[PDB]
Amino acid sequence: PTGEVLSLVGKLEGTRMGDKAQRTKPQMQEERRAKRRKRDEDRHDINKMKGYTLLSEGIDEMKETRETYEVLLSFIQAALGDQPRDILCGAADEVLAVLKNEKLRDKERRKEIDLLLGQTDDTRYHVLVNLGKKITI
């Protein structure tokens, strides 16, 4: 058996020309995917306020912190009754910064905050303890 390169003439019968041709995959799919994911969660503030111009818009003045924030808004919306966005978010600021700034004073919280929310009952007070718990030149 010599090492001579023999002709392929007559030695192509079991093979096709695309037979064993392969295609590569994109190099670093997941690294570019992670870069694009971090970019699309960093561009949320800019693309959120892209069409909003300081002059001509009405709601100008008015990520998993936001979901406890939304369930706090929804608790206020359920026990307070379908007010605009600034009313609910100001009540959100009020409730979270008043159960955070108790310095863990707890027995005084009914007579301020369910008095604010209209004395639903104290089962919703032990609902609302977990709101303030799950907050944090």
Added chain:
Amino acid sequence: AVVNTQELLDLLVKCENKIQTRIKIGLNSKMPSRFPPVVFYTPKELGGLGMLSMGHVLIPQSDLRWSKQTDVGITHFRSQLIPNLYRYIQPWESEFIDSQRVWAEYALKRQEAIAQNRRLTLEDLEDSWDRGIPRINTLFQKDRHTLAYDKGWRVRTDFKQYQVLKQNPFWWTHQRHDGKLWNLNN
């Protein structure tokens, strides 16, 4: 057209043996008997020459033995014909029907990604990857917008033969615009 031309397959193994014969008479002026193909066809990283083969090179079963010693002793091992280049290049008819159908898939994916307001990422168009006559690869290049203003580039690459003394074998294509129209990793 190479696989159909038998004169070219004869000429290809004649030129391959000519290159190998110049390598062999650079080794030793006495022309050997049974010179091993392993020194030509081993890739350059693994020490060899990295020769691509367009001819039937049968490797002997003698050339596939290898020993390995550790303290239990010497353990002997074995492992065939060398792959030819034509099997690893897609036929042109296959290239054109896959280019047609893959740029059709890109057109529908592009209009549904303009519907979703986003850009076409790498996760869609990953099945289309080394595919298309302009390769789908060329969509994901940084310089691609610049290459949208490089008109008449194929006539330019043909006329490079009157400006550059180095003969271009890819006179007909460019890596930038058409993509890499072959893949010899496997």
